[PDB]
Amino acid sequence: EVKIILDRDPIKTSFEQWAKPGHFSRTIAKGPDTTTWIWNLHADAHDFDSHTSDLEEISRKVFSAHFGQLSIIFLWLSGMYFHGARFSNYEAWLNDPTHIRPSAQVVWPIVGQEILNGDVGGGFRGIQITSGFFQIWRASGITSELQLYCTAIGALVFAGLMLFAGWFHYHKAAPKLAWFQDVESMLNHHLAGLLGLGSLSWAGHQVHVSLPINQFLNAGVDPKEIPLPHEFILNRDLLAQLYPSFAEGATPFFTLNWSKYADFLTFRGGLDPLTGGLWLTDIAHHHLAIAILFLIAGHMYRTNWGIGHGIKDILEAHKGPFTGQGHKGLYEILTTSWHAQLSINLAMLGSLTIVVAQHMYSMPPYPYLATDYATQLSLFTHHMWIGGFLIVGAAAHAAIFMVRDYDPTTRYNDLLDRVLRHRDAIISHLNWVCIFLGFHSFGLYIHNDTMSALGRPQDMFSDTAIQLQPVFAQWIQNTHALAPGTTAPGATASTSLTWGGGDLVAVGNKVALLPIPLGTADFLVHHIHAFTIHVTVLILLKGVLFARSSRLIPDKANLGFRFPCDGPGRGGTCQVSAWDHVFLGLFWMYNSISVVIFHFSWKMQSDVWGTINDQGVVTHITTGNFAQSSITINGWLRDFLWAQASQVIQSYGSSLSAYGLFFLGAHFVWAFSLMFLFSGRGYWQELIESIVWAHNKLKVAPATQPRALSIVQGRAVGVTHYLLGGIATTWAFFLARIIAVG
């Protein structure tokens, strides 16, 4: 076969269908008879494979939808750059980053809100931002508000192009099903074209704009005096005085004999003692390897020249004694089901966001990011939630595939088979591990609480009594310390300062990073992590494996992916559906992530962040109480929650009172969720009966018959507010705390 560009001519464009609500569904396009109609309209709006059964049409819908998504992201980026141009103190912050608070939002003087425009420094009144954009912009060598303004226009223009493309590829030239399926092609391009050229491109701006300008900023020269980026490209003299390797052209690269380029590219590693961020000389070099690597990787798959790989070939040839003919037929499944692809992608993109958070705190990439605790606590916590959510979404679509696309008669797999043929063995074991982890992580805490309360500190699990020293993580930690020179001779300093041992970095009076200690307190929390994660996995995997059938419900697959139950029979069968497993898994992801970000916040303030003076004396924020008081639930209640929540409950009258409002505001919607979660629509519908009576009495009863929320929606509404309330509370709590104290 030969891969090519395939499209079709115009397929309609009119406001006619805008005027017709629920047009996409044949059931709902007839209009409402009850208020249920309205909710269904929004819940089935994006269910494309529920609209039609043609794979070509569904594929064309999701393709333009991605253009729509990108359009928004570009419009969203356009605003952040614009606000950094009109309503910000970036130019002020650019001179004194260590003392001036970054702010990019001014509030109108109505009703008394102007109080939120607090003293952020630089003779500026506004709201302190924790997005981190200031450190990105300084890293890109962005000097003036003009350049941020130009990027704002550039992003807005791109937003228009993205939006235009979506219309063009759904209404004008719609890609054919064969085009979407060319996966050997797409992977080649996304590997080489998007990632390879993308990383290559940024490696260029760095070694021409970022690296030159950043050196000036660090020398201490006034930002307004620093030559524009284009003065470095034109006159190579400027980029020759600093980084003299530029004296030659393509040589030595072209003549190989690498390199005299060690001058602006190196494997130094560690952290810049003056900026607190990763060496820009390393990052530029880093993107150089990433480019080439992905450019190499972009030539694995065979297309139109017989050289490369057929993915279908690779899979089929991977079969063992234990697994059967497994992997055979996976290519046809993954090229035929969107949900199958989305599940894998969510699981992986979500997992990636989580490693990003752990990598950006321990290896601070942007200049003056480490000592801005307000941002670092926000960035880590933000990615933890984003990654956390995306992972739960993988379970949902894995389940949807099982219900909707799974067909043994047409697209058998054998690997997917067998798994279903011992799903009780997998779930029963995962059940056991969770119970073991629960007792052996949380039970240790309850032990500690009881012994402490009985006045038996020596009978506790602690560093001063019965120690549970996490030696495996400690040994590794030590190994990365002895890594440079010994294992990796090219590396000058350690990978991270958490592995440094006897190295510390400070910017201003604040600590950027230092070796992070590990003790019994860290042992207990990690098993708590190991525990909470497994239970989340249990709920979701159980939902996927038993999505189709069960000893209780032989034909669950016929009931669909999202149904309330199958009645009170068989003892009761509420929340048997795969949807309800995602619903239940959502709470447990929340439970797990919440104790993760609390683990972060306390550990950093207690053992890492704090004030340092020029005598070496380090004074941490909470003063190193993590080791002796995080090993007790009462300790978490008192020394963590009670103690640190004082900032947000004492923020009224201050610039941080909005956090005080959102603190209580989020407690409200959280408790509000409990009305929906603890009750059933049977009561509410009967209550509405008495209320409907009153309206009929006064001739003001609506034709659209009011109905209580569906059983599933009641759960959807409940978990949504439980999440919004709980997460927003910690948000207000975190930001108020870290902005006031930090």
Ligand X SMILES: CCCCCCCCCCCCCCCC(=O)OC[C@H](COP(=O)(O)OC[C@@H](O)CO)OC(=O)CCCCCCCCCCCCCCC
323 part of the interface to ligand X, by CB under 6 A: yes
207 contact choice in another protein, ligand X, ligand CLA, none (CB below 5 to 8 Å, kind-dependent): ligand CLA
Q: Are the CB atoms for 78 and 152 separated by under 8 Å?
A: yes
d(CA 707, CA 200): 57
Closest by CA to 580, choosing from 533, 551, 532, 544, is 544
Q: Are 362 and 731 in contact (CB under 8 A)?
A: no
| Binding of ligand X by 681 (CB under 6 A) | no
Q: Which of 92, 115, 186, 504 binds ligand CLA (CB under 6 A)?
A: 186
Residues 18, 254, 305, 322: which binds ligand X (CB under 6 A)? 322
- Extract the tokens encoding 685: 């519908």
- Closest CB to ligand X among 254 and 322? 322
Say whether residue 328 binds ligand X (CB under 6 A).
no
Sites for another protein among residues 36-65 (CB under 8 A): none
Residue type, 476: I
Half-sphere exposure of residue 663: CA atoms within 13 angstroms, side-chain side: 19
C-alpha 464/C-alpha 454 separation (Å) is: 17
Residue closest to ligand X (Cβ): 320
Stretch 236-295 residues interacting with another protein (CB under 8 A): 248-251, 254
Which string of x and - marks every residue 158-197 that binds another protein (by CB under 8 A)?
----------x---xxx-x--x------------------
Angstrom distance (rounded) from CA 169 to CA 443: 57
Mark the binding-site residues for [4Fe-4S] cluster, compressed into ranges. 565, 574
Q: Which does 321 bind (CB under 5 to 8 A by kind): ligand X, another protein, ligand CLA, none?
A: ligand X
- Which residues define the annotated binding site for chlorophyll a? 675, 683
Q: In the sheet where 610-612 sits, what is the strand order?
A: 505-507, 510-513, 610-612, 618-620
Question: Does 500 help bind ligand X (rule: CB under 6 A)?
Answer: no
Q: CA 165, CA 146: separation in Å to the nearest integer?
A: 29
Which residue type is seen at 4? I
Please tell me the distance from the alpha carbon of residue 390 to that of residue 342, in angstroms, as a whole number. Answer: 10
Say which entry of ligand X, another protein, ligand CLA, none residue 189 contacts (CB below 5 to 8 A, set by partner kind): ligand CLA
Question: Cα dihedral sign for 245, 250, 255, 256?
Answer: positive
Instruction: Specify the residue, 199 or 494, whose C-beta has the smaller distance to ligand CLA.
Output: 199
3-state secondary structure (DSSP) of residue 513: strand
| 471 makes contact with ligand CLA (CB under 6 A) | no
Tokens 């303004």 correspond to 149
> Are residues 705 and 34 in contact, defined by beta-carbon separation less than 8 angstroms?
yes
Binding residue ranges: 565, 574, 667, 675, 683-684
List the single partner that 6 binds among another protein, ligand CLA, ligand X, none, CB under 5 to 8 Å by kind.
Answer: another protein
From CA 604, how far away is CA 382, in angstroms rounded?
16
Three-state DSSP state, 611? strand
How far out from the chain centre does Cα 322 lie?
36
Binding site for ligand CLA (CB under 6 A): 42-47, 63, 66-67, 70, 180, 182, 185-186, 189, 193-194, 200-201, 203-204, 207, 233, 236, 246, 249, 288, 342, 346, 389-390, 392-393, 396, 400, 431, 434-435, 438-439, 442-443, 446, 535, 538-539, 561-562, 579, 582, 584, 586-587, 720, 724
Binding site for another protein (CB under 8 A): 2, 4-9, 14-16, 18-19, 21, 110-111, 168, 172-174, 176, 179, 230, 234, 248-251, 254, 304
Binding site for ligand X (CB under 6 A): 318-323, 326-327
